[PDB]
Design a protein around this ligand. Structure first.
Ligand SMILES: Cc1cc2c(cc1C)C(=O)CC1(CCN(C(=O)c3cc(C)c4[nH]ncc4c3)CC1)O2
Ligand SMILES: Cc1cc2c(cc1C)C(=O)CC1(CCN(C(=O)c3cc(C)c4[nH]ncc4c3)CC1)O2
Lengths: 695, 695
């Protein structure tokens, strides 16, 4: 016992495994429920400082398999785990769910065989994933592992013999490995006969049992671990389309561990904890040079956070757990439950303060969440303090995160207007490799930012089941050689596919000073998903096939400009006199044609042509969007009830035929108010529509 | 008329539009059905030279919209198209479908407003896509376009006035653009009042109508084309998951045109025909330097074929059409129809000739399709001449294509064992940029080859609805810094997702001399999709978590080697004598431990542990796989009929309970033979199982 004379018992001595976990730079697996209790308690503190919490606000029950392999809740002492994978079912009262929300936490035990995945760990991880999927509840994975378990048949190590070419000179080589009748009997004695595949041979009267295959008696040596790895890789792929999945890399995450991080998609990496496939020393053996110094060069946050594998980084385990809890606050309690409303001090009924200017550089985050100025706080479109940015280390030209609009959670995509620089590190494996600095112009979709956009759309849709707003402000895709070679078309197409799959309301809004051109409009048009998408443009937004310079270059050429010079009152001395005035007003007539082109690019044309639902004023956008979204969520709820009993067009027309004659279908507030006052009446209607018998 | 005195009429004079198409380096849209007739006729020639074809083997009917906008078949003269998009419904008798197969061909008319997409072209393209989707038939798109249609309100060009700051000095600027009562009357006269949005103002007694927005009277100027672009982008996204889609880039393909190529996924690019987003000259204006010389630098085959956007290249239009027809020969006639069997001279009942050797370099294509040697043809696993390689210009470390196994079509994925070099071109936009040569070791998955693998899996599954074989031979994923930074985890995870979605039988086979290790096994394990996947390993294959060098480094260290030195019969003079023999046999004891490790890595262990279905011998693999696949396709057909009337496990157990008691469930040939002799009897059974009434 070390140390002696502590006020309370030494937890690292009561359970030496806790001390082993700490030596390896991570939290002991049985101490993670306490971190979730601390993080959940903090959630309440930042929400309402005055609320009084008792320990019954948080329940954590360990999950273990019974005799029939069925998961059951247990209360036992830490360190009693017979396998290297542990799970907990957590029931927490949170600001969004004051009566309680549940989730499962699965975690490797880094103290159990270096957190390696053997067949029993794979089977348990899969059972826990299926448990969460069946219930529709989130699955949190805490990664601290060494990949698939490796081993040899240890019982064959002291028994095997080698059939030397020349018994006197071992350096001359050998023909095969074999067992004697003695070794074969040792195996028969311990019932390990099936540990080897032998072919009986007689050499100089002596009977040699040639080793054809080593199988081993212990399960968890090779390919059986690899099979279990594929099982959990497939299970995690499926879990991502079904429930909310998130991973915290709390110590190293190796091989299958690294794949699980990516397959669950949502990943928080603790600083200094690597996500790797093969370790640096093994890579050095294969390369035949000391190419890499550490595993952090291969899978540290400067790799994984910068390339988007890690959505966030955390300074320590508790910071990571806090980020999970915060991410979950935007997510429904379980699959197909409504998005969790959380009204705060910042109410819907207010104008939007921060306004972007054409002559001044702005951070898109100010438009989203507002900004602190010397004269006070300028409110953004969304609730003050509600913006939770993710994938912040990668493709910084697009800004993605979760926010709240009068308490309604949603995914947000914004465009960074400032030039973005990213540094490609020098490849240690190549001597002719130096670090590259890539500059990417603002408001242009590049391969990485097009990929980030599609990824964001998919992550809001799957598991999170959130509505979304895209503050659409792109000039187009980068059509240059390097970006075309780097497959910008592939990544741009992923955006389209992501939108086609979207199951919650989407609002596309070209903001003030914003633009949507040829290539960028295509990929975000509401006809891609008419059931879910709506487009709006600010009164101060622009949209056209080309920018005005482009339209002029193609459709307002020299001849047209010269015919227009016949607005200005003005053979050899005349030809030089015409060319004198023609060179004089060409700069101003260029501005005239540019302005003529720009007059087609307005929200009024967009309205007249029926390509946008409405033109809006930025200051009034929060009030407008709050009721449009609230009304859309209410109607979406009614369409789904109708479905559990026809095209969408027929469904919504039937629901709207139930609205009183006096209700204006175009008034969002009135429609939302009527539905919410009549949910139980509409239920009676839906239940009566059970006069359903159709062949 | 030029030229005069030709034996037959001058088609380019009868229809001047045909001549315009030729001047632009492409086939005239109304001449493409003739190319399909030529290509289909050639298909018959290469199949059975002796078959006599009459013109009724091929029917092509143009599709146009009626008064109600419904598509109808017409017989009219070329060039009568009132829109820049044309379509044909083709009915062809082919070797796979001698009674006929149908498909739709949609094409831009490059002679109609430079093949630009206006709202009517977008609407027609969408209607044709829906037409094909409803019928389940393939949609071929022939790309020859200029992107979305651009324009200005031409009626406002001769009427608009400018409100100068100083009428005497135009160079001093202007305040706005306006109309006079005269211009407003001209608009009222031609019923173009709504062409402008004006605000009435009185300046020095004169009434000026300030132009607030130009709308135009002509539809197809701006954002309405962009809306139509999004519509067809979404429609093509959907078509890809539903029907067989393919594109031939026959002239330039711009903007929405470029996106349509990628969204239909399967793309054949004619040499010298660019796939671009923005043209070189427009990019030069934005960059303020003459950075690019041609559109081919941006989207030629050296960009698109090399990055995998173009699956194939073609020398001309007919070569492209031939490749479409050849690709289609592996594809069902329509959605959910069985895969088209096409038995040729190369029958199932033969051994596999070409065998890979560990000591000799081989081309994986020899294992697939066989090879010509001086002593005759060495047959591969698949039918002679049946390998149709796709995505051949990109990520050459993986070999993908379609093949036939005793006539059964399937997708094939193989591993290139030779080192692959790809040249990244120097970026013209950056002066500090030089061409890079990337070398990638064989049997290692890199980001591009992991992406190609996932893409191949998806393309065989969607539209093609093919079974698949993966000749799995990977050491793992590249875990190095550059490949980890370049997101190898993301691309590796796409493989898992692709397999989870697979709806036809899959065979994973580790071939002779082949290997599957830690990272590579995970991503291809049959537990990822148990309903469709099966794994097999050759008697001469290897599989383990690590390569033997790795297992030894972790589980057969110095101490274990020294304890093993007690197999060799041999204080200050003794310590130097022990270290003398210890340095002597360390190289051979290293080989002993490597061999001990390798003995665990065999197909016999894989069988004993239940991770593979069977161990096979390469020479007998064609006979084995033909019947396993044929039997799997028959059982898959029965499970589907049961579904249209329970888990898969319950379904297959019910179907197998119908087999006579004497049928061995494990005998593929016997099971396949029994099903095919009894299809109509099994139908009677399925129809009698209509005593189905369940709440
Ligand atoms: C800064 C940046 C912006 C870009 C691009 C890349 C970068 C690096 C792209 O590749 C796309 C683009 C290209 C210019 N865009 C046009 O509409 C356009 C078109 C024509 C015909 C033009 N003639 N003259 C000017 C002009 C402008 C907007 C879209 O914007
Ligand atoms: C040529 C190439 C091959 C590679 C890699 C990259 C390249 C470039 C990878 O990143 C993955 C790898 C890494 C070596 N592999 C092992 O199993 C492995 C493991 C340990 C612990 C080892 N100690 N000593 C040797 C050894 C070998 C196979 C998989 O194979």
């Amino acid at each position: 016992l070390r140390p002696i004379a502590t006020p309370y018992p030494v937890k690292e001595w009561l359970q030496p495994k806790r001390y082993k976990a700490h030596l390896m730079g991570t939290t002991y697996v049985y101490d993670f429920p306490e971190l979730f209790r601390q993080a959940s308690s903090s959630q309440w503190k930042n929400f309402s400082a005055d609320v009084k919490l008792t320990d019954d606000f948080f329940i954590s029950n360990e999950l273990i398999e019974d005799e029939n392999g069925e998961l059951t809740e247990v209360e036992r002492e830490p360190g009693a785990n017979a396998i290297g994978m542990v799970a907990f079912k957590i029931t927490v009262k949170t600001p969004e769910y004051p009566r309680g929300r549940q989730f499962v936490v699965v975690a490797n035990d880094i103290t159990f065989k270096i957190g390696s995945f053997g067949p029993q760990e794979d089977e348990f991880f899969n059972k826990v994933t299926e448990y969460a999927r069946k219930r529709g509840i989130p699955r949190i994975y805490l990664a601290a592992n060494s990949g698939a378990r490796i081993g040899m048949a240890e019982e064959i190590v002291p028994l095997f013999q080698v059939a030397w070419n020349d018994a006197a000179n071992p350096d001359k080589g050998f023909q095969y490995l074999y067992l004697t009748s003695e070794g074969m009997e040792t195996l028969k004695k311990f019932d390990k006969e099936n540990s080897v595949l032998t072919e009986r041979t007689v050499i100089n009267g002596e009977e040699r049992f040639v080793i054809k295959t080593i199988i081993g008696s212990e399960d968890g040596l090779g390919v059986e671990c690899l099979r279990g790895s594929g099982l959990i890789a497939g299970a995690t792929s499926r879990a991502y389309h079904d429930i909310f999945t998130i991973t915290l890399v709390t110590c190293r995450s190796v091989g299958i561990g690294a794949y699980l991080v990516r397959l669950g998609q949502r990943a928080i990496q603790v600083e200094g904890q690597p996500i790797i496939l093969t370790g640096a020393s093994a890579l050095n053996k294969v390369l035949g040079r000391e190419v890499y110094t550490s595993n952090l060069q291969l899978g540290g946050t400067q790799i994984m956070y910068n390339n988007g594998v890690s959505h966030l980084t955390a300074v320590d385990d508790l910071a990571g757990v806090e980020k999970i809890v915060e991410w979950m606050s935007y997510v429904p309690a379980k699959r197909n439950m409504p998005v969790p409303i959380l009204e705060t001090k910042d109410t819907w009924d207010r104008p939007v303060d921060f306004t972007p200017t054409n002559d001044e550089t702005y951070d898109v985050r100010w438009m989203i969440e507002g900004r602190e100025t010397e004269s006070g706080f300028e409110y953004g479109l969304f609730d003050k303090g509600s913006f939770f940015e993710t994938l912040s280390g990668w493709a910084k030209g697009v800004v993605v995160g979760r926010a709240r609009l009068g308490g309604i959670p949603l995914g947000v995509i914004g465009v960074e207007t400032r030039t973005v620089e990213n540094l490609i590190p020098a490849d240690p494996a190549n001597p002719n490799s130096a670090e590259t600095l890539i500059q990417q112009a603002g408001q242009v979709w590049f391969p990485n930012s097009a990929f980030k956009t599609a990824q964001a759309i998919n992550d809001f849709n799957n598991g999170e089941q959130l509505p979304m707003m895209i503050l659409a402000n792109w000039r187009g895709f980068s059509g240059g050689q390097r970006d075309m070679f780097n497959e910008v078309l592939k990544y741009g197409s992923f955006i389209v596919d992501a939108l086609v799959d979207y199951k919650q309301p989407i609002i596309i809004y070209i903001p003030p000073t914003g633009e949507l051109r040829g290539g960028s409009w295509v990929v975000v048009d509401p006809t891609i998903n008419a059931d879910q998408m709506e487009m709006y443009a600010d009164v101060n937004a622009r949209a056209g096939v080309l920018e005005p310079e482009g339209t002029v270059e193609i459709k307002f050429r020299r001849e047209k400009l010269l015919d227009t010079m016949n607005r200005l009152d003005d053979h050899q001395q005349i030809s030089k006199q015409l060319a004198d005035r023609e060179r004089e007003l060409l700069p101003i007539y260029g501005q005239i044609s540019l302005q003529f082109a720009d007059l087609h690019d307005r929200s009024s044309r967009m309205v007249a042509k029926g390509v946008i639902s409405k033109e809006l004023e930025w200051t009034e956008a929060r009030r407008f969007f709050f009721w449009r979204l609230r009304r859309r969520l209410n109607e979406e709820y009614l369409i789904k009830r109708l479905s559990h009993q026809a095209s969408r067009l027929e469904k919504i027309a039937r629901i709207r035929s139930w609205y009183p004659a006096s209700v204006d279908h175009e008034d969002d507030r009135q429609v939302a108010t009527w539905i919410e006052e009549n949910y139980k009446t509409l239920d009676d209607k839906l239940k009566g529509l059970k006069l359903e018998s159709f062949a």
